[PDB]
């Protein structure tokens, strides 16, 4: 129901966007729109410790450390290509004219 889909709408985003999570993994191409029926599951190891078993994929990815460094680096350079010549650039050119 929607009361569960609004809970797990985030790790479904990560399973949809797996190919961005890790620069060395490179999944094979499917789209994977969210299925109508699914079920969240936890892997039972038979006889990661108890300190680091979580309740989302998202919490595992956030509790990881060098992945957050990679996401911050890649986001910042995506940002500084996206902001490259648009409007702070344009007014720095106009005020470079108006200075002298």
């Amino acid at each position: 129901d929607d009361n569960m889909r609004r809970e797990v709408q985030r790790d479904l985003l990560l399973i949809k966007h797996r190919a961005a999570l890790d620069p060395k993994r490179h999944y094979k191409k499917q789209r994977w729109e969210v299925p109508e029926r699914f079920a969240i599951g936890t892997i039972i190891e038979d006889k990661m410790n108890r300190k680091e078993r979580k309740s989302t994929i998202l919490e595992t990815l956030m509790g990881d450390e060098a992945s957050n460094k990679y996401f911050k680096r890649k986001y910042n350079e995506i940002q500084e290509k996206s902001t490259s010549g648009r409007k702070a650039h344009y007014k720095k050119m106009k005020e470079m004219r108006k200075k002298r």
Binding site: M93, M96, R97, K99, R100
Partner: protein, 99 residues
């Protein structure tokens, strides 16, 4: 290359804006000019299309959605920025419950 030396197809580098004229930044060359000119040309082409439609308007035009859509005092269109799947004014029982 077939009958061309590697010392024949060398790379002629390009020049910069003058040091005196440096506040008008980036002396632009022909690739930058065609990036300028073809963008102005496509924006003029869609502006010419919209002026053609405004001339050929036919003011006895009747679509049924002009019972919901409405036009402001300047003549332009009012687009309700929230939705049009939700109602803008929430009634008094709704405001009772939200408050």
């Amino acid at each position: 290359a077939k009958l061309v030396h590697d010392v024949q197809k060398k790379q002629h580098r390009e020049r910069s804006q003058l040091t005196s004229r440096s506040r008008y930044g980036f002396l632009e060359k022909h690739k930058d000019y065609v990036k300028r000119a073809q963008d102005f040309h496509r924006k003029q082409s869609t502006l010419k299309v919209l002026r053609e439609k405004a001339k050929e308007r036919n003011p006895d035009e009747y679509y049924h959605a002009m019972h919901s859509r409405k036009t402001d005092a300047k003549g332009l269109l009012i687009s309700s920025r929230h939705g049009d799947e939700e109602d803008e004014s929430l009634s008094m029982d709704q405001v009772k419950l939200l408050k």
